Design an enzyme around this catalytic site. Structure first.
Site: not given
Ligand SMILES: COc1cccc(C(N)=O)c1
Length: 350
Positions: A243, A246, A327
């Site tokens: 995470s 991101y 995920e």
């Molecule tokens: C798009 O894939 C993911 C997979 C797992 C977490 C996240 C996140 N934004 O925390 C995104």
């Protein structure tokens, strides 16, 4: 002056920072001269998703190149881009289209932040910070650094920091207990489900005014189902590492925000590869992409009845999987109840 605690004041200033909104847009290569923050509208973003959806369809099914060129032109006219001295790339590569769908997911939250920032601010009897805080309709509280709650969360952060993501350390600067208005109520029905876990959700600091006021949400009807690995749901992880990436921080901008949400997983539909899910099989409540590494199931604790996978990154027996880490995806906005917001400091190895 502000009645809020300092940490919260600093948090509000950060999520409503206009310069950060522009930086985000510049990184997505938007032309800020032709497309300023004030021009962004929801209708505009919806149209852009549809165009991306159509172009995606034409690339997959082998549509006319004339079709793809016309779709690209309409997209770049709707959202002006600045490619500098280079020629503008066509929306003819599925990877580039996915990048553009991601950009729109972000513009949706930025648009919300700006609209709120320019909203009801006339009141002179309230400090600017206090006014914007109230606009979030989210009660935010500082979690005592020494309490048990904080200890467990710091353990979750330390233990679940992956091996391959050790290009940076992570320091928990501040932990906030958040409670969005009406959220506990829409989530109530899901306390009847089993397998409720405290999972991670990372995002840019620029998306947080949108996340707090509207809550985490699934992509709109216009977005191509293809723009997302497991379809249009809400994504979470069990490794702080996954995470954290991101958050899109850097050596130059090291503070990121990350969420811990309670998510009603129930019976998970386990997958080893991508699948653009539309329908969830009867009896399944969520999706779980299996990874080669995951927290040690041994160390799993509970916090107010919710499972916390704070174990150390142990390799799972599965080898035929595309994912490095797990995920979790829910396809119903009511399946999640946000709990904490952490202010993280990414320490980069130099
Ligand atoms: C798009 O894939 C993911 C997979 C797992 C977490 C996240 C996140 N934004 O925390 C995104």
């Amino acid at each position: 002056k502000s009645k809020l605690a300092k940490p919260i004041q600093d948090l509000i200033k950060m999520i409503f920072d206009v310069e950060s909104m522009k930086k985000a847009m510049v990184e997505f290569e938007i032309d800020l001269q032709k497309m300023p923050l004030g021009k962004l509208s929801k209708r505009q973003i919806q149209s852009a998703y549809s165009i991306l959806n159509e172009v995606q369809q034409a690339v997959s099914d082998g549509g006319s190149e004339s079709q793809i060129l016309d779709l690209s032109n309409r997209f770049y006219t709707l959202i002006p881009h600045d490619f500098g001295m280079k020629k503008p790339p066509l929306l003819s590569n599925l990877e580039y289209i996915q990048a553009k769908v991601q950009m729109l997911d972000n513009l949706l939250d930025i648009e919300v932040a700006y609209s709120l920032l320019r909203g009801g601010n006339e009141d002179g009897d309230k400090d600017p910070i206090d006014i914007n805080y109230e606009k979030l309709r989210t009660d935010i509280k500082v979690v005592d650094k020494d309490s048990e709650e904080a200890k467990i969360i710091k353990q979750y952060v330390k233990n679940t920091h992956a091996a391959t993501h050790n290009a940076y350390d992570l320091k928990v600067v501040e932990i906030f207990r958040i409670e969005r208005e009406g959220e506990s109520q829409r989530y109530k029905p899901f306390k009847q489900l089993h397998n409720r876990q405290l999972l991670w959700h990372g995002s840019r600091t620029t998306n947080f005014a949108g996340i707090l006021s509207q809550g985490l949400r699934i992509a709109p009807p216009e977005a191509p189902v293809t723009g997302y690995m497991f379809g249009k749901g809400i994504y979470f992880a069990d490794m702080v590492s996954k995470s954290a990436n991101y958050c899109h921080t850097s050596q130059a901008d090291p503070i990121g925000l990350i969420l811990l949400g309670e998510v009603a997983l129930g019976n998970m539909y386990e997958l080893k590869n991508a699948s653009h899910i539309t329908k969830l099989p009867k009896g399944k409540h969520s999706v779980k992409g299996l990874g080669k590494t995951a927290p040690d199931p041994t160390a799993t604790t509970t916090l107010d009845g919710v499972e916390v996978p704070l174990g150390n990154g142990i390799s799972t027996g599965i080898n035929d999987t595309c994912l490095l880490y797990n995920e979790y995806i829910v396809y119903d906005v009511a399946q999640v109840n946000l709990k904490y917001l952490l202010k993280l400091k990414f320490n980069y190895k130099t």
